[PDB]
Symmetry: D2
């Protein structure tokens, strides 16, 4: 049992959760998280109804559901040249003081889209209401089994989000003649994506573990924290 | 093994499968079909290499996935007054020479959003590439197990497509105080919705049955039928 | 100075202005109105501080901008068979118990896109916050001089809203080979469109006349009527 | 008369054009540009029908139309702390190895939207078919008079593009507690946007000059170069 702060417990926020989640996954030990004042999505609770929280983790009140989390590898011609993971997503991204980045999205070996773009977001349903949400994404209910593909500012006619089945092979091909790209996962863990390389995102063998205290619907979080006028 | 035209076999189009597959639906027997010149999505075989198909119908060579399908009934407080099912999706539609239709959208029995609109769409993943796509909805992998909610011309701040978990219950309550609506199922099977009714879609217990001949990736159908510019 | 209810004065709603403003339209005399409790966009005055308004109607204190309005006629090869005008917009709409409507979209007499759909919308900038908004269209500043094209539930790769120059001619040719459609004007004034017709909208020579009482910024209307979350 | 390369003439592409355009504006001298093989939007011609090009610039075949171009100022409390311009746009942007950037969009002194975001794109109609296009933007016909406001990946419920009248005051307020932001214009001319600062985009007194050789419709460029299936 462990704590990361301002079974796994975390007392802070979404930023700290995906920080939490990293090891909690790593150690196949269910993560648990509670808000510390600052409003954030992923946190099952606020820092106000506390005692019950801790108590329930001692009284053993929660569950662990297989949240899709993704494994990312960059490989240089046959040759895996880098590996990663993320609870939220794998953000393919261009440098900042740079221009449009050339990229090919292939799913299950068919290239579904090519374009110039800020980058590509392949996100879990678990993180469907983040950046991918930012990029026009649909909301995915955390318990789905699927992969979310949402391009980042694509100079293209077609960039409609695609949601494929949990078992497919998403590939971003980085143009040779172009620039080194970037990958960040859940906000951290940058890696370099050399031009000519090729991203490849897939489901990771070990999903992370999500400790539900209130076994209530996503619909209850989603409206309250986003402030949906359900009028 | 029956034949239908514009084991189940059909020589027509999308509405011929929905017609064909309609009857087979009750007769538990997997649907299979050939597109008829003019672009048709769900046809595993086309109006060009039709003959060759036959073999799979004679040797009975293909496989069947239980595609998520949806069950719908309109109810006025505890009184289920009608039910429908769908291959593509279930569109609630306002009267035809009418105006915006009054609405509150509930998911998980939780109200997510209220508004006037053309209406709201509830789709099977396979229907995400039909009406829902046109109406602003994302692409879902056909083999998915999940439900898609797309509001139809919603005079709203937010009408983002929602991809729900198959273990859900989507319900739209129709304004009593206003006009009676319409509901369609696979675009066919229209039904009349009393003002004040409550729409309610859920994962259908009896999937449709699919005759897959050539086990290629969905990205190959999606590309040609949609003619995706990987330009 | 005439009064209409759910100088031109009205005590109703958006469709009461469109009704009121309708007749005044021929009578060249600026429209002015008060919203009636339930949210109404175009009302420069509301159902709360109504009385105070009056002054501007008695002292005749306000000003008039010539809001771009549009002229529409349906023609079958050189034969203009009907015409309409609009405050908000001009929606081509498919038959009501029908299916997708066949279409080629031409702007500047150049074909930009073809498809089936619910239909296509042509709007005055003031109509961009009405149907066109709901149908996927952007917000245009009301005082604009420009025309907005928004396709309505278009089974297409690309149906991006188009904001054209007022010095243009937008034309949608309706499939002959298929079904007859419908066209509306301010949602009212429906017209029947023969299959094969050719829709043609252009900058209307005779703008509507606007009675602006309180010279505030449009962002103040837009915020309250829309209730924009600057949260 | 002057040339920038691989009255103003330019022989290269869109990248070089907005490079061209900078001074050509600066020296109130109409810009003119011709493709040099590499496909790009803004260039009136290709490097294949050349002689006529040059010739027409000597025979004086073209025109100069007042393309909206924008003036940008960043000011530190009353105090203008930096000024800019751009033919395309003013891109408000967060650092790259950073997180969501806090920002308030006010038009004509009413704050229309606040959110966390990659940044804000305020673009001319002249550049409507670029990044703003990337960010979900509508296409604006170059000759319009308007300002385009398109947020860059906003963690917000509402980020609908807004098109206001040419004479309004767009303001992005950079949160104090946040991070220094960035501005790039047409790809160049970076400037630093300190937290607590406040962006302010407006029409620049001197529009740039666009030299039309073929006085044809935008619709002709737009379909050909984008490859619109107008089928
Ligand atoms: N929308 C954008 O422009 C943007 C900026 C970069 C990062 N992000 C997301 O933020 C996450 C990291 O956050 P940060 O601490 O680095 O701060 P940040 O400045 O990058 O902003 C992140 C915001 O998104 C929220 N968030 C994080 N993960 C989420 C999720 N899965 N679902 C819903 N909301 C979530 C956080 O609470 C915070 O409000 C990344 O995993 C990425 O998904 C999106
Ligand atoms: N686009 C719209 O706004 C709209 C309006 C009416 C109904 N529909 C759709 O019509 C479908 C039934 O089609 P129909 O054969 O009766 O003809 P139709 O005249 O209603 O037009 C259907 C169009 O959608 C295509 N289509 C049908 N199912 C599809 C699928 N699952 N994936 C991709 N494309 C598909 C057909 O090829 C055809 O081009 C319904 O499932 C509904 O989704 C769409
Ligand atoms: N949302 C849709 O899919 C849809 C379908 C039918 C027609 N319409 C719109 O209906 C409008 C006429 O409205 P109605 O009074 O006859 O009632 P209605 O029953 O057709 O609903 C109109 C709704 O749009 C609002 N509205 C009307 N004009 C507006 C404007 N210019 N800006 C912002 N909001 C506006 C009204 O307040 C009302 O909420 C037409 O101009 C058309 O744009 C929209
Ligand atoms: N879509 C994106 O993700 C993205 C990336 C950054 C820059 N841009 C745009 O590109 C421009 C600068 O181009 P760059 O040479 O630095 O290369 P770049 O790598 O930034 O890509 C720019 C692309 O946009 C095209 N372009 C530039 N201005 C345009 C316009 N006004 N309308 C239509 N297309 C245009 C260029 O031809 C090129 O294909 C900037 O002004 C900005 O508008 C957009």
């Amino acid at each position: 049992v462990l704590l990361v702060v301002h079974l796994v417990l975390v007392l802070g926020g979404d930023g700290t959760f995906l920080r939490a989640a990293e090891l909690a996954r790593n150690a196949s030990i269910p993560v648990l998280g509670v808000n510390l004042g600052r409003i954030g999505f992923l946190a099952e609770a606020e820092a106000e109804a506390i005692d019950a929280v801790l108590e329930h983790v001692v009284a053993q009140d929660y569950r662990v559901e297989d949240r899709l989390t993704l494994d990312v590898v960059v490989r240089q011609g046959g040759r895996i040249v880098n590996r990663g993971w993320a609870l939220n997503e794998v953000s393919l991204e261009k440098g900042p003081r740079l221009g449009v980045l050339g990229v090919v999205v292939e799913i299950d070996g068919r290239p579904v889209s090519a374009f110039g773009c800020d980058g590509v977001l392949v996100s879990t349903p678990t993180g469907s209401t983040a950046y991918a949400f930012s990029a026009g994404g649909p909301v995915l209910w955390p318990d789905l089994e699927a992969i979310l593909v949402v391009p980042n500012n694509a100079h293209a006619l077609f960039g409609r989000p695609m949601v494929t089945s949990p078992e497919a092979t998403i590939a971003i091909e980085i143009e040779a003649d172009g620039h080194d790209a970037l990958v960040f996962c859940d906000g951290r863990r940058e890696m370099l994506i050399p031009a000519g390389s090729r991203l490849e995102v897939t489901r990771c063998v070990t999903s992370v573990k999500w400790a539900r205290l209130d076994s209530a619907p996503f619909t209850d979080r989603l409206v309250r924290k986003f402030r949906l006028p359900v009028t």
